[PDB]
Symmetry: C2
Subunit: 112 residues, 2 copies
Amino acid sequence: MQQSEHFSFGEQTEIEDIGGGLKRQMLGFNHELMAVKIWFDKGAEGYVHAHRHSQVSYVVEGEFHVNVDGVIKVLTAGDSFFVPPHVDHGAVCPTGGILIDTFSPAREDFVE
Amino acid sequence: MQQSEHFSFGEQTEIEDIGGGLKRQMLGFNHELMAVKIWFDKGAEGYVHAHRHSQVSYVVEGEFHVNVDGVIKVLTAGDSFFVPPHVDHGAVCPTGGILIDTFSPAREDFV
């Protein structure tokens, strides 16, 4: 839809079941910037992955095993990672948790 | 500095006192994307102001009075806002609290 409302309330915006133990909520977007909220079930993952979009991620809560470019770290609440364009990366959450994923271009795949 | 490390740690990243009862911590960036964490002291205020950068913001915790394009809303943990380029926006935090601000180009002024 080109862009989102200027305001979003966590309690109204639909939380979308995208399979794989993952749930996604739009926080706000336009053509060049986009932020979503992802809930991980215990042990859920984004299977190992790459894309053009720049990506910055923030751990809201839970323990995240994150792979960026073969470097591997365990991340907890308050931590973040950065994925350059086209860089290989992965994320696993054994405990369950919440991420804020932000991307520069928007991800057209998400705006269904 | 081009860009950040691929990994950043809440207990290690230096948190910068940026005056007005605001503090900022870098979460990760390159030329085209940037995410920072802002701590508001109780009653501290984010001046209304505009810029080309797109902005998407998430409220981690606290109560925020947020202005975008003159419309004002009370935001609490889990809510978010989006500021189109060059649109007026600002935020006041009566209770004290925490934001994540994300920008597309990077905010070159914050490095």
